[PDB]
Amino acid sequence: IPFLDYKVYAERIFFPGHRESPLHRDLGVPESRRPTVEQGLGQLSNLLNSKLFLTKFIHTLETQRTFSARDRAYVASLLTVALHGKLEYFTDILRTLLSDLVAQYVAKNPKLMLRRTETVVEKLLTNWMSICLYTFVRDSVGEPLYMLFRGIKHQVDKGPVDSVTGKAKYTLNDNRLLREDVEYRPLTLNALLAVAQGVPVKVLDCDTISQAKEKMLDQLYKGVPLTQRPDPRTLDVEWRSGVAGHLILSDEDVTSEVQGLWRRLNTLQHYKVPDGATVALVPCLTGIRPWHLVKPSEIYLTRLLSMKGTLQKFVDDLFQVILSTSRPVPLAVKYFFDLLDEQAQQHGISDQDTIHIWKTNSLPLRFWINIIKNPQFVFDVQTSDNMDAVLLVIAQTFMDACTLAPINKLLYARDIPRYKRMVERYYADIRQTVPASDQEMNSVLAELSWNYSGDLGARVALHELYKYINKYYDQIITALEEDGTAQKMQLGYRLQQIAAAVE
Amino acid sequence: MQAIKCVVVGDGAVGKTCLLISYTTNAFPGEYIPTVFDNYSANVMVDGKPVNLGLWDTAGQEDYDRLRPLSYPQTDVFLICFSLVSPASFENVRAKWYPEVRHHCPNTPIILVGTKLDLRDDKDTIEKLKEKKLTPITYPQGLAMAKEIGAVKYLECSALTQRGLKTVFDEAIRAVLK
Ligand SMILES: Nc1nc2c(ncn2[C@@H]2O[C@H](COP(=O)(O)OP(=O)(O)NP(=O)(O)O)[C@@H](O)[C@H]2O)c(=O)[nH]1
Ligand SMILES: [Mg+2]
Numbered sequence: 001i002p003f004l005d006y007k008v009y010a011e012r013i014f015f016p017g018h019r020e021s022p023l024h025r026d027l028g029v030p031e032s033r034r035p036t037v038e039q040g041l042g043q044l045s046n047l048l049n050s051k052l053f054l055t056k057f058i059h060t061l062e063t064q065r066t067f068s069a070r071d072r073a074y075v076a077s078l079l080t081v082a083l084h085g086k087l088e089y090f091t092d093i094l095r096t097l098l099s100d101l102v103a104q105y106v107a108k109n110p111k112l113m114l115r116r117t118e119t120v121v122e123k124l125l126t127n128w129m130s131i132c133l134y135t136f137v138r139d140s141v142g143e144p145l146y147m148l149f150r151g152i153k154h155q156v157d158k159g160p161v162d163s164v165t166g167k168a169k170y171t172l173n174d175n176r177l178l179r180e181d182v183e184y185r186p187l188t189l190n191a192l193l194a195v196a197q198g199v200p201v202k203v204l205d206c207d208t209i210s211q212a213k214e215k216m217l218d219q220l221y222k223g224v225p226l227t228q229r230p231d232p233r234t235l236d237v238e239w240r241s242g243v244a245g246h247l248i249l250s251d252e253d254v255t256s257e258v259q260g261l262w263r264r265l266n267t268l269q270h271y272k273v274p275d276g277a278t279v280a281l282v283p284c285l286t287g288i289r290p291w292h293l294v295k296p297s298e299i300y301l302t303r304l305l306s307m308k309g310t311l312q313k314f315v316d317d318l319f320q321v322i323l324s325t326s327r328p329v330p331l332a333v334k335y336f337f338d339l340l341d342e343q344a345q346q347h348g349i350s351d352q353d354t355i356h357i358w359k360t361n362s363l364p365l366r367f368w369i370n371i372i373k374n375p376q377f378v379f380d381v382q383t384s385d386n387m388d389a390v391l392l393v394i395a396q397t398f399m400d401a402c403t404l405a406p407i408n409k410l411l412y413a414r415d416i417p418r419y420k421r422m423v424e425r426y427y428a429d430i431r432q433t434v435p436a437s438d439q440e441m442n443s444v445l446a447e448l449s450w451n452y453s454g455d456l457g458a459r460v461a462l463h464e465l466y467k468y469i470n471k472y473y474d475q476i477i478t479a480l481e482e483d484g485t486a487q488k489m490q491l492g493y494r495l496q497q498i499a500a501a502v503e
Numbered sequence: 504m505q506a507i508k509c510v511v512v513g514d515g516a517v518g519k520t521c522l523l524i525s526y527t528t529n530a531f532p533g534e535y536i537p538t539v540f541d542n543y544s545a546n547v548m549v550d551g552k553p554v555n556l557g558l559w560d561t562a563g564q565e566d567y568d569r570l571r572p573l574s575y576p577q578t579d580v581f582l583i584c585f586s587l588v589s590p591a592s593f594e595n596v597r598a599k600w601y602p603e604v605r606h607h608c609p610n611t612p613i614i615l616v617g618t619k620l621d622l623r624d625d626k627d628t629i630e631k632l633k634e635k636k637l638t639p640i641t642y643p644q645g646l647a648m649a650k651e652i653g654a655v656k657y658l659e660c661s662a663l664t665q666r667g668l669k670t671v672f673d674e675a676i677r678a679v680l681k
Contacts (some may be wrong), residue, residue, distance in 0.1 A: 239540075
């Protein structure tokens, strides 16, 4: 069961788009001015540990016109990596930032709360949750989440697949559903890994030599995590016949099907490969439109229900674990939903329906939604495109159950009133159980700076955070001295000293 | 140490697999099974020089045609085949084989080879030939074919007897060296 360790899980959650944490690279400072800068950054960290400073810092950036919501994510994520030590403080930074968001939503519409990252705090609590719940995820939810992922992977390949458009016999989305049907026969060929023991692999005559290579690897390295698995671009498919076989087939070669501007890919049926063929994955030697089953340029309820119906098995289970009352309420959840309940009475909101959407767009629609949506956050796995369309349609099914109010709606319409029960059933425990003491809380928050193995990239985090400071320097000086306590703290000068320490 | 890649392309059941096996084991197969893409190996001595002959069997069926071109790259010497006991297998030399070979490899030397020599001289075989109103291939019929295609030699042989089969490959080794 390929579980990503905390380092990977966190990096992938805080820094998603780049794939790998951009906090892994050297500062880009020469050996000469190298020690003079390294020191300055340290003083930036001590400056950040001032709740008085930090609050003003973010508030100034949020107001800037040039500060995109893309920066809002990066700044929250850098700050998360930065304050990974002072977690007790990181929570206080949020405790304070939450109360600020609360007052701002009273004027316009309080129901629209925590919908889009138009604020930096919206990202910090997704990061916050992730830090807290990582244990729980690995410990309980991990299991059915992996199950559903293997289940979907399996159930899709029991049907043909177009290596070009990206459509299959099975999915939960018409925008991805393979409308046309093709002539496909099932193959079950003995696969060898000659990089020598033979593992039987189940492909389909229609699969390209590429898809067939992947399907082969999936069995030849069943429980080996992606990073431990070798690269497929280093591998070549080699068929075997008679005394000495030896024939290296490929996706596109001498035997490719050119039809003017339409060149087809090479399949197993294309080469006349039979059942039980000895195929070995051996190392690599080294404007016509490409196609496979349907050349590129209404619902089909019946087709999707077969797929839903297969996957229901673990769909039920995954939700029955996330929304579990049988297990006790994790402290991070209970604390937070009571952190909101403390805020609800401070501004006078008796309406629990307004409270629920702040509660929903916190833990499930902030956190749980993402893990269902994207499983590459917990598992060292390669996620298919059609896989994601399926998973997303399971996340939009879970989501419709969370919130009190197309395909996904009148598809799971049978199970959606069942999950709506589970949501309320879960929020019953949230209030009925013993509230979590802050004395008892920071006890857990400290052991998380402990159990966080190493440096997630804090060096770069401070340098990258200074890259921001450097651009918005003066606008910061404004809030640095317009405040009375900020003058007393000598914050302005503290910053100035660091500013010169870098340059 | 010079290695010679030799590909034997020939019509359905001309006796390639058999002639390839006979040369490398000095034993005849017996049973017919249509070959897909089989590889053979032999270490020879021609004019006081050691050579590794890396043989390549191919198909004589239109079914395994979508795959045959893969055997072709970097071939040092080709072996275009036919059976002396069928002119159908001989006419397909000018029709299927020669065109296919040169379409890909325009420099590789060809050697037209007449397999099943033992059956040509047999009476009982000529009886079946006469029944479908046909006559077997002779040395001048084949020598006219080899000069026509641009073959570097014409060799007649048989796999069950090993008659002039030794020569067939020794000549193919010579066909590379100059
Ligand atoms: N009498 C005699 N029979 C032969 C000789 N060579 C081949 N045969 C026969 O004719 C058939 C040839 O088998 P085979 O070698 O596989 O022909 P092939 O050209 O390799 N077939 P393929 O096209 O599938 O590669 C067999 O039934 C065999 O008994 C020969 O020299 N003498
Ligand atoms: Mg054969």
